[PDB]
Design a protein around this nucleic acid. Structure first.
Ligand SMILES: [Mg+2]
Ligand SMILES: [Mg+2]
Ligand SMILES: [Mg+2]
Ligand SMILES: [Mg+2]
Ligand SMILES: [Mg+2]
Ligand SMILES: [Mg+2]
Ligand SMILES: [Mg+2]
Ligand SMILES: [Mg+2]
Ligand SMILES: [Mg+2]
Ligand SMILES: [Mg+2]
Ligand SMILES: [Mg+2]
Ligand SMILES: [Mg+2]
Ligand SMILES: [Zn+2]
Lengths: 129, 242, 107, 151, 173, 125, 146
RNA sequence: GGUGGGGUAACGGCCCACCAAGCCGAAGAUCGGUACGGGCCGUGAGAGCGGGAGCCCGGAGAUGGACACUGAGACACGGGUCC
RNA sequence: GAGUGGUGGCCACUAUUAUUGGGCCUAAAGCGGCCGUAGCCGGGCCCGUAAGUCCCUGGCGAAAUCCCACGGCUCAACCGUGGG
């Protein structure tokens, strides 16, 4: 059965970008997926996106630009402290500032660079590069 | 200690508040029971030999002590195992010098030179207070000494207050209350050797110790245990501090 | 009456000398909160508390549970299934070293 | 997929997204409640009443009207029946499954060698136990209620 | 547990017979006139340690990190291995020849106190060389920059006389 | 002799292998069964730390206290009942909580004769 | 086969149990923990042993090699067992006599066992009457007591 | 486990008299094997894997098994009794 | 190179124990098939709580051992004063 809407969205995106699709539809929407999409758009990985209302949980429509090498979810959502971002970067990313880790903190969802600037930790939920 | 009390002390196991070389020899002086506790005092022999340097070997240090050349709180001490602790006054009258024993910024005991007039007074923290037969009040200070007061003055003394005592006559001449705005000097913990003024007091249930907040000279605030705060004046120190 | 816990005392009184509210017993040390899982013996309950333990090698958690036997004063008289608050005292039997002081949520 | 057969049927309803009832619908809420009570008194099941309303009276699902008493929730057939005391004592699907199991058991008494039909009985009773556990959790059944075929 | 055991201060090669490494090390040994391979290896280890400290501090941050960074730079330029205006990155470009140039033997040879490396080694060992008023007999001692200029013949040595037969031959070069 | 160290059985019922000898500071002593007699008899025990306990073996008098706070020294007739042991009453054994009869009525013992060396009782109404 | 399991955040106990369960399939781990080698080792964990020679024999090499390898039977002092030991060297067998005492050690094959074309022999002779056998073979020394 | 006592320097099934049926367990009881615990030590890029004689802190023992006297402190390695 | 060889043990080699990070059509390896209890994993929105989780701050986790700079034995090994 369905267990993780967020993982399906990122796997769908990375599958679609490899065959040059220009847009995708994320089927079960949620606030968390919206936040992740906002963060991804801020750094220029995706184009514009919009929310479409059906009688069910709603759909997301996303424009792709062919600027993503890989995107995935992190399970389990490990907790991370404010000064331990380096080893996770080595575990998931290819260079010392290549891509972003997405962190859920008590102040919202943000990339690990902003969180390190604010000096706070949280839970890792995804990576994009 | 399988069958009885210990009598020896290795150099490597010596208390961490002393200035001593831990690998030079095997043994160290095991201090005698006395005024302060183990963690806040040092045997007199190390003061005579290692700190001041008046003696090179232990044997000649004992010859100095047996002649009564050293005064601790105005009383002659001949035992080389006698413990010397916080706020004590060490006086050498023949050379006319006086020191006060104080903790360092990192938690070690050092000697602070003081004037002759200041050498006659010792601050004592009221550690406990109880009733005794004949309906009198007994005060127990932080260095283990005791004093008696009549039932009439039972409201002028409470725990954590500081009493200025004239030595060696042991006569009271000043009482400093523990309240907001009092001047304090920290004696243990992470913030040892810092000084300042009291700002706030907090309490907790089920017997956890209470905490105080202190503002220093530059206006920074820091917290510490209430029992680690030693009152030394109303708004300015009454004694010289480094 | 207050015993340092800052909670409400029980409704009625008892004659047990081992009751911290009405007897001579004193409480000092740790204070725990748990769920009663057995009350068969006279004046005795078993309380279970759950927690998580972290396995460093596998960077994951596991669930562990702790069971403590406690004295049950007649003025309180806890039953199976309710949340209770227990405090540490002097030894009372071979296995009893705690006493129930309050019922937080009746079953 | 299906619970036991593992097939992947997709047939079902495709309800369009709408909030307010359509303009061409003319009945009011009270007429709808009267119709529901009448049909229930005729002896129909909850699922059948909605089918009749949709087919003959041109009323799409009654879940288009706000509940007049409780503004926070929309109106459903079971709530309408509850407001008048005609609600079933046992949830309908559980009742239907139990009724199916009773009829099958008396068949297997005359045909002890019909092993392929017996597996159907086992699956039906598994469904029954799942449902009874769920309903006990939510408080729709007394905690002592038990399903015994020997009844 | 177990008490402390003192450990070696150098590291041996992972594989004893690699042709390229043998050639390179033979060239170094012949040029600087060392006694045995382990001596050479010792200096190599020193270099590695420096590099390993620079790599760790680049990716660090905090209060202690700055202190250790400036301490490393000060120590390196006190030895004469870096110019006065060097930065942390320049640590990663040091070579093995840089360290070997700081040995007392090499410095004695370069200053002209001897004609040959081996002669310099013998002069050091027999006690004819003084460094800042002190006699040192270890040819592998690393010379600080501040004391480099005060290196002479020992004031009680026979060589501390310009009429000595052997000194004149040294001056002849 | 009498050892009061620890149980050799775990609460789950498993056995325990003893891992050391018995220390001197863990030993008990013989119970003192205080009897009723014509004349009193007591001894002194030297205890841990060089202290003392006064142990009473034969009792003849008692101190009986009233609700008013006044006491009288009277002699003991016999033991009526003793809830501690089923056969102490027959053998005339005095312990805390026993019921005795005296020349002025029945009384209930409130002291520990084996630990204090005296008998104190409250008068029953 | 699906994804490796368990992966959940709160599934530590099952993961640890799985890893512990399948570690017993590793023969190296099983032999060490159960101490199987110690239970059958005639040398009882020693690196060398001392024994007394009973007789001289010769063992044929395995195919396709050809030749006779000289060995002796040795009775161990510490426990009285009897083993076979090889005598390395050209003509080394002439320096051994019956009722001499020898020191033997492992022969150095794979997995601490036999080597080369002589399986069944696990030990080699090192000293004869407290004198190194290699010397006796080369010269430089003479066998004591004739 | 409860009630009432004894004993101890002191709380306690530590030991008794009386009243109940409890307590532990597949989240591994009970039983068997092996071993003094720790600070630490060896190895590896790290995650880990292996060891824990020597120096410090804690424990236990004096040919094996039991038991006492003196003393603030022992059931005492260079003190006592039995097998 | 004043050392250099032999035997036995542990780690690495080894992603041949795999959380990071392995495999199961034909090479070792998917129960003959299914139902289901504990366990583990679990759809969307709103309100509350603050156990997990994150940040700040008090009291602790002896010394020796480890890393860094400076100082004393000719430098070093070793030892002392400070920072971790
Ligand atoms: Mg161990
Ligand atoms: Mg050990
Ligand atoms: Mg290999
Ligand atoms: Mg493989
Ligand atoms: Mg199959
Ligand atoms: Mg098969
Ligand atoms: Mg969900
Ligand atoms: Mg919390
Ligand atoms: Mg330490
Ligand atoms: Mg020097
Ligand atoms: Mg130096
Ligand atoms: Mg040192
Ligand atoms: Zn009560």
């Amino acid at each position: 059965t369905l267990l993780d809407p967020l993982a399906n969205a990122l796997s769908h995106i990375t599958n679609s970008e490899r065959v040059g699709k220009r847009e995708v539809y994320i089927k079960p929407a949620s606030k968390l997926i919206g936040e992740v999409l906002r963060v991804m758009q801020k750094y220029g990985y995706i184009g514009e996106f919009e929310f479409i209302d059906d009688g069910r949980a709603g759909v997301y429509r996303v424009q792709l630009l062919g600027k993503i090498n890989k995107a995935g979810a992190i399970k389990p959502r490990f907790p991370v402290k404010a000064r331990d971002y380096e080893r996770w970067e080595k575990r998931f990313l290819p260079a010392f500032e290549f891509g972003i880790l997405i962190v859920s903190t008590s102040q919202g969802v943000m990339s690990h660079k902003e969180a390190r600037e604010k000096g706070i930790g949280g839970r890792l939920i995804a990576y994009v590069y | 200690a399988r069958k009885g009390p210990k009598r020896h002390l290795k150099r490597l196991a010596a208390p961490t508040s002393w200035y001593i070389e831990r690998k030079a020899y095997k043994w160290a002086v095991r201090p005698r029971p006395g005024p302060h506790n183990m963690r806040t005092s040092i045997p007199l022999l190390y003061i005579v030999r290692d700190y001041l340097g008046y003696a090179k070997t232990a044997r000649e240090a004992r010859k100095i002590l047996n002649e009564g050349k050293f005064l601790v709180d105005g009383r002659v001490r001949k035992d080389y195992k006698f413990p010397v602790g916080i706020m004590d006054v060490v006086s050498i009258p023949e050379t006319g010098e006086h020191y006060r024993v104080l903790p360092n910024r990192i938690g070690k005991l050092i000697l602070h030179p003081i004037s002759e007039e200041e050498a006659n007074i010792k601050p004592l923290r009221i550690r406990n207070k109880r009733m005794v037969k004949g309906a009198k009040i007994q005060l127990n200070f932080h260095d283990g000494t005791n004093h008696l007061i009549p039932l009439s003055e039972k409201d002028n003394y409470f725990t954590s207050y500081t009493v200025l005592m004239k030595v060696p006559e042991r006569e009271i001449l000043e009482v400093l209350p523990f309240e907001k705005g009092a001047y304090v000097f920290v004696t243990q913990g992470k913030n040892v050797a810092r000084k300042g003024r009291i700002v706030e007091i907090k309490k907790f249930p089920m017997g956890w110790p209470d905490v105080v907040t202190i503002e220093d000279e530059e206006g920074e605030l820091f917290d510490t245990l209430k029992e680690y705060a030693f009152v030394v004046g109303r708004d300015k120190p009454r004694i010289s501090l480094p | 009456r207050d015993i340092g816990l800052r909670i409400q005392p029980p409704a009625e009184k008892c004659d047990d000398p081992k009751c911290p509210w009405h007897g001579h017993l004193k409480i000092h040390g740790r204070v725990f909160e748990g769920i009663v899982v057995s009350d068969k013996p006279r004046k005795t309950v078993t309380v279970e508390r759950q927690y998580y333990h972290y396995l460093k090698k596998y960077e994951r958690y596991e669930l562990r549970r702790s069971r403590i036997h406690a004295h049950n004063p007649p003025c309180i008289n806890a039953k199976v299934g309710d949340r209770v608050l227990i405090a540490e005292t002097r030894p009372l039997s071979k296995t009893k070293h705690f006493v129930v002081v309050a019922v937080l949520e009746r079953a | 997929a299906r619970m036991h057969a593992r097939k992947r049927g997709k047939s079902g309803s495709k309800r369009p997204p709408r909030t307010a009832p359509p303009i061409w619908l003319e009945y009011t809420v009270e007429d709808i409640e009267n119709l529901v009570v009448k049909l229930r008194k005729e002896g129909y099941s909850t699922a059948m009443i909605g089918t009749i309303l949709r087919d003959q009276y041109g009323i799409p699902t009654v879940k288009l009207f706000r509940d007049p008493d409780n503004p926070n929730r929309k109106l459903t057939i079971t709530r309408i029946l509850e407001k008048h005391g005609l609600a079933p004592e046992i949830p309908e699907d559980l009742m239907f499954l139990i009724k199916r199991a009773v009829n099958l058991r008396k068949h297997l008494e005359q045909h002890p060698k019909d092993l392929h039909s017996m597996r159907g009985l086992q699956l039906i009773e598994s469904k029954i136990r799942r449902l009874v556990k769920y309903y006990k959790r939510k408080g729709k059944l007394p905690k002592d209620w038990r399903y015994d075929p020997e009844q | 547990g177990d008490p402390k055991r003192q450990r070696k201060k150098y590291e041996t090669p992972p594989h004893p017979w690699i042709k390229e490494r043998l050639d390179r090390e033979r060239v170094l040994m012949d040029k600087y006139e060392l006694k045995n391979k382990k001596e050479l290896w010792k200096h190599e280890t020193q270099l590695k340690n420096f590099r390993r400290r620079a790599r760790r501090l680049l990716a660090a941050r905090g209060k202690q990190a700055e202190i250790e960074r400036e301490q490393l730079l000060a120590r390196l330029k006190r030895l004469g291995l870096l110019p006065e205006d060097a930065v942390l990155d320049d640590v990663l470009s040091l070579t093995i020849e840089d360290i070997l140039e700081r040995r007392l033997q090499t410095i004695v040879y370069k200053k002209g106190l001897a004609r040959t490396m081996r002669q310099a080694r013998q002069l050091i060992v027999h006690g004819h060389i003084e460094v800042n008023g002190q006699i040192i007999r270890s040819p592998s001692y690393l010379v600080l920059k501040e004391e480099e200029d005060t290196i002479t013949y020992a004031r009680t040595s026979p060589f501390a006389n310009p009429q000595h037969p052997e000194r004149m031959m040294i001056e002849k070069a | 002799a009498i050892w009061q160290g620890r149980s050799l059985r775990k609460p789950s019922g498993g056995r325990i292998v003893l891992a050391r000898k018995k220390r001197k500071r863990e030993l008990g002593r013989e119970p003192s069964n205080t009897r009723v007699a014509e004349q009193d008899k007591r001894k002194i025990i030297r205890t841990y730390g060089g202290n003392k306990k006064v142990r009473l073996t034969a009792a003849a008098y008692a101190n009986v206290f009233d609700k008013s706070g006044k006491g009288r020294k009277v002699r003991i007739i016999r033991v009526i009942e003793n809830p501690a042991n089923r056969q102490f009453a027959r053998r005339n054994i005095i312990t805390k909580g026993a019921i005795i009869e005296t020349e002025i009525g029945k009384a209930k013992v409130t002291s520990r004769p084996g630990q204090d060396g005296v008998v104190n009782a409250i008068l029953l109404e | 086969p699906g994804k490796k399991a368990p992966n959940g955040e709160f599934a530590g106990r099952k993961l640890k149990l799985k890893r512990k369960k399948f570690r017993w399939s590793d023969i190296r781990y099983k032999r060490r923990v159960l101490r199987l080698k110690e239970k059958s080792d005639p040398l009882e964990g020693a690196p060398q042993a001392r024994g007394i020679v009973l007789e001289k024999i010769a063992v044929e090499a395995k195919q396709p090699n050809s030749g006779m390898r000289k060995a002796v039977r040795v009775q161990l002092i510490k426990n009285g067992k009897v083993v076979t030991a090889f005598c390395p060297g050209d003509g080394a067998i002439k320096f051994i006599d019956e009722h001499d005492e020898v020191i033997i050690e492992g022969i150095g094959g794979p997995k601490g066992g036999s080597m080369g074309d002589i399986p069944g022999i696990r030990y080699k002779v090192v000293k004869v009457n407290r004198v190194s056998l290699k010397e006796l073979v080369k010269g430089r020394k003479e066998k004591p007591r004739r």
